[PDB]
Design an enzyme around this catalytic site. Structure first.
Site, PDB file in Angstrom:
ATOM      1  N   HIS A  40       0.812  -1.217   0.000  1.00 12.55           N
ATOM      2  CA  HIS A  40       0.000   0.000   0.000  1.00 12.55           C
ATOM      3  C   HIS A  40       0.848   1.271   0.000  1.00 12.55           C
ATOM      4  O   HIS A  40       0.314   2.381  -0.066  1.00 12.55           O
ATOM      5  CB  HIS A  40      -1.050   0.005   1.129  1.00 12.55           C
ATOM      6  CG  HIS A  40      -0.485   0.205   2.498  1.00 12.55           C
ATOM      7  ND1 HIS A  40      -0.147  -0.843   3.326  1.00 12.55           N
ATOM      8  CD2 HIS A  40      -0.229   1.335   3.198  1.00 12.55           C
ATOM      9  CE1 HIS A  40       0.293  -0.367   4.478  1.00 12.55           C
ATOM     10  NE2 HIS A  40       0.253   0.952   4.424  1.00 12.55           N
ATOM     11  N   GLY A 178       5.234   0.147   6.005  1.00 12.24           N
ATOM     12  CA  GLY A 178       6.364  -0.283   5.199  1.00 12.24           C
ATOM     13  C   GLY A 178       7.621  -0.490   6.016  1.00 12.24           C
ATOM     14  O   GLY A 178       8.554  -1.173   5.569  1.00 12.24           O
TER      15      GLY A 178
END
Ligand SMILES: [Ca+2]
Ligand SMILES: [Ca+2]
Ligand code: NA
Lengths: 223, 58
Positions: A40, A178
């Site tokens: 994402h 992330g």
């Protein structure tokens, strides 16, 4: 990172910042040319910033390298969030030393209770908004699949795991996605999602890196 | 039908800090907010221009 502490300049050498005109996600350096992040976090014109501490000031140990490739897992599902992993190739190899170093991939999955280090430049407030200049750190345990599923009914896949404290107050938050969840020197997780941040009974959910080791190695080697 | 331009901005469960635009009917303009990176609703734009074109005057 909510409820954490100041890591200290370059104490997490594998932590990188993904920049698209500003910091929007974190990532983990796995070798001189590759970074692991969340699917994402796929954005256009990504610039990877290595050797960073204060994200708002040039301190002299930074390496700004543009992404030459941003490979989202072919099975990433934007609805269920399953397979939330992305591999970023650096346009030029990063100069590795102490301040900029890679983190090892896991040889086996981690068990519930294992203490890990989660880091990032994300929001430091559970209610409200406050983004730090320097890198924040948090020690948190991996939680059982059973407790994770109880916290998020019908939402946890085999490629996700929960980590944190059920009482609330300590968690990863917006801007940390992330980023790394390192346990015993191995990258076991990627900051992914959760119901808010640091909320009671709502621990952070992370991508289970140990399930993608073969894919990561083969993908990197084929690009 | 319910105007999606009048729905409050939705950051979502994902933890990215992406600057997105939403139409703020109260202020009568497209404003910035943090998009988490997933499960975006429709009042979530990549630019002020996209937001104004889609929701301007709502
Ligand atoms: Ca800096
Ligand atoms: Ca605004
Ligand atoms: Na510093």
């Amino acid at each position: 990172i909510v409820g954490g502490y100041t890591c200290g300049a370059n104490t997490v050498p594998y932590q990188v910042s993904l920049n698209s005109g500003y910091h929007f996600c974190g990532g983990s350096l796995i070798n001189s040319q590759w970074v692991v992040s969340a699917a994402h976090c796929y954005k256009s014109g990504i610039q990877v910033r290595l050797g960073e501490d204060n994200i708002n000031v040039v301190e002299g140990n930074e390496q700004f390298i543009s992404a030459s490739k941003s490979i989202v897992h072919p099975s990433y599902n934007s609805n269920t969030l399953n397979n939330d992993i992305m591999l970023i190739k650096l346009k030029s190899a990063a100069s590795l030393x102490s301040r900029v170093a890679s983190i090892s991939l896991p040889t086996s999955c981690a068990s519930a209770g294992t203490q890990c280090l989660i880091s990032g430049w994300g929001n430091t407030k559970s209610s409200g908004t406050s983004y730090p200049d320097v890198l924040k750190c948090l020690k948190a345990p991996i939680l059982s699949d059973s407790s994770c599923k109880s916290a998020y009914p019908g939402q946890i896949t085999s490629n996700m795991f929960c980590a944190g404290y059920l009482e609330g107050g300590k968690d990863s938050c917006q801007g940390d996605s992330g980023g790394p969840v390192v346990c015993s020197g191995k990258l076991q997780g990627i900051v992914s999602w959760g119901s808010g941040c640091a909320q009671k009974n709502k621990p952070g959910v992370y991508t289970k890196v140990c399930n993608y080791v073969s894919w990561i190695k083969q993908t990197i080697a084929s690009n | 039908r319910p105007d999606f331009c009048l729905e409050p901005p939705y950051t979502g469960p994902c933890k990215a800090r992406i600057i997105r635009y939403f139409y703020n009917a109260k202020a009568g303009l497209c404003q910035t907010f943090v998009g988490g990176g997933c499960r975006a609703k429709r009042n979530n734009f990549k630019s002020a221009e996209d937001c104004m074109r889609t929701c301007g005057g709502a």
